Amino acid sequence: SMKIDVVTIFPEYLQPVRQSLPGKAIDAGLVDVAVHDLRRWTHDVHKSVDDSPYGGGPGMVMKPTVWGDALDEICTSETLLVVPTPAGYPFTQETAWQWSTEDHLVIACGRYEGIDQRVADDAATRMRVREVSIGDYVLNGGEAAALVIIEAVLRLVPGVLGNSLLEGPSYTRPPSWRGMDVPPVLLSGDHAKIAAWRAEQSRQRTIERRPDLL
Amino acid sequence: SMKIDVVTIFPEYLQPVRQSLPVDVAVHDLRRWTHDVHKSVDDSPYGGGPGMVMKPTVWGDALDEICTSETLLVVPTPAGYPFTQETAWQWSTEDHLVIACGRYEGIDQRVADDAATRMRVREVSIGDYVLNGGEAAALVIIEAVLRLVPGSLLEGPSYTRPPSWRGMDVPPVLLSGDHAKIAAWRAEQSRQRTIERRPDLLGFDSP
Numbered sequence: 542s543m544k545i546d547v548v549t550i551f552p553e554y555l556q557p558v559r560q561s562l563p564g565k566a567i568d569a570g571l572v573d574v575a576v577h578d579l580r581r582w583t584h585d586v587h588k589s590v591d592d593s594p595y596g597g598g599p600g601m602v603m604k605p606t607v608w609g610d611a612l613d614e615i616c617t618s619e620t621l622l623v624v625p626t627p628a629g630y631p632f633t634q635e636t637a638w639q640w641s642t643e644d645h646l647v648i649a650c651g652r653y654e655g656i657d658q659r660v661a662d663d664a665a666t667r668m669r670v671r672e673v674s675i676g677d678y679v680l681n682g683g684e685a686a687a688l689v690i691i692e693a694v695l696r697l698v699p700g701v702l703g704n705s706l707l708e709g710p711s712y713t714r715p716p717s718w719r720g721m722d723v724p725p726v727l728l729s730g731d732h733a734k735i736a737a738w739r740a741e742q743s744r745q746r747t748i749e750r751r752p753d754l755l
Numbered sequence: 756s757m758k759i760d761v762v763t764i765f766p767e768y769l770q771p772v773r774q775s776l777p778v779d780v781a782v783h784d785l786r787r788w789t790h791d792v793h794k795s796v797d798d799s800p801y802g803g804g805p806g807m808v809m810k811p812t813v814w815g816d817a818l819d820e821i822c823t824s825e826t827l828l829v830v831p832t833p834a835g836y837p838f839t840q841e842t843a844w845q846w847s848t849e850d851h852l853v854i855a856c857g858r859y860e861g862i863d864q865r866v867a868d869d870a871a872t873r874m875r876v877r878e879v880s881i882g883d884y885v886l887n888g889g890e891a892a893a894l895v896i897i898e899a900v901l902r903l904v905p906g907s908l909l910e911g912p913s914y915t916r917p918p919s920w921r922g923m924d925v926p927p928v929l930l931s932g933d934h935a936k937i938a939a940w941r942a943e944q945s946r947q948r949t950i951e952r953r954p955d956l957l958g959f960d961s962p
């Protein structure tokens with residue numbers, strides 16, 4: 542049973558993942574995802590969420606007073622606060638597993654050059670805070686990362702889904718297609734040989750594509 | 756200029772792009788290329804195993820219509836080469852990206868094999884986590900690439916006003932106006948952060 546709250550200045554970005562949730566899981570109260578417009582917590586008629594960086598630099602920094610108010614309202618002491626950031630610890634499948642048992646995740650999506658560091662530092666004095674990165678590529682903001690994290694975590698939550706080495710190639714019908722035959726070993730009925738063939742394909746593909754895994 | 760076509764059995768999920776764009780991005784329902792009226796796109800794997808594999812026939816017909824010889828065909832897959840910022844720079848000058856989003860247990864390998872006989876094909880992973888399909892990966896790839904289209908160390912902490920908030924001060928050096936001291940402090944924060952969070956970037960063992 543997980544509640545995920547996402548806070549973002551582009552709530553529209555997160556709406557399809559909300560609607561993508563299986564009806565059965567929602568009706569069974571297994572999962573709920575709520576998306577919040579950060580500007581709900583702005584102080585001024587211009588709905589300002591950012592300001593210039595102390596010490597100079599490019600772009601803007603998201604305001605701590607706005608974020609502080611948002612998180613005060615949404616978080617409790619039991620919340621796991623997730624802050625996507627290119628400067629985070631790596632988000633891995635082990636991370637997803639660990640988070641899949643949580644009662645409450647709050648995902649704070651940043652933009653511009655990030656969120657004033659005191660927001661996370663203050664939050665960390667009364668709840669668990671995790672700054673994480675989903676990869677070594679540069680995004681404009683945290684929403685795409687939130688989407689990846691939500692998908693990876695929720696498919697591990699018991700119910701939501703319904704009812705090493707790289708994977709090698711897979712095949713299905715037809716047995717011959719555009720001059721290419723399914724490897725005959727797969728149609729052999731020799732299931733120990735099939736498993737050995739798959740193991741070797743995995744080893745080859747891992748060596749070629751992901752030598753770091755070895 | 757760049758055209759991106761995304762092929763998926765969940766086109767409604769790609770709508771986070773059409774909000775985020777002033778390049779052209781078009782999304783295609785894979786089932787438009789089925790002839791059966793169950794609109795079936797998958798079947799059990801040869802050789803056995805759990806789940807289903809997407810049939811090559813439907814994909815072949817879709818890609819036949821959408822791709823040309825100059826197309827860069829991108830196939831997100833947990834079994835891909837890593838998609839990195841270097842990849843994003845490389846792809847930022849392409850005229851035409853087609854992103855083939857798999858579901859179930861992936862796409863019959865012959866789809867990529869056949870495509871590679873007439874265009875360039877790149878199977879890539881955005882990370883070592885398990886997604887339900889390639890659509891979220893497509894969104895990440897599109898965002899990383901589009902921001903680079905013409906037209907080391909972790910980043911340290913950032914701060915803005917007010918200089919004191921809930922009794923927490925912005926590090927005084929950042930208010931000093933001393934550019935050399937600020938650069939030095941930022942370099943040191945970045946060093947600490949990278950060693951702690953991403954030692955691999957500096958050539959050390961991961962925990």
Ligand SMILES: Nc1c(O)cccc1[N+](=O)[O-]
Pocket residue numbers: 625626627673674675676677678679680681682683686
């Ligand atoms: N990489 C990145 C980014 O550039 C911006 C926000 C979040 C992330 N991330 O989670 O990896």
Ligand SMILES: Nc1c(O)cccc1[N+](=O)[O-]
Pocket residue numbers: 831832833879880881882883884885886887888889892
């Ligand atoms: N990791 C993953 C996946 O589980 C499914 C499709 C694509 C990816 N990926 O690009 O990393």
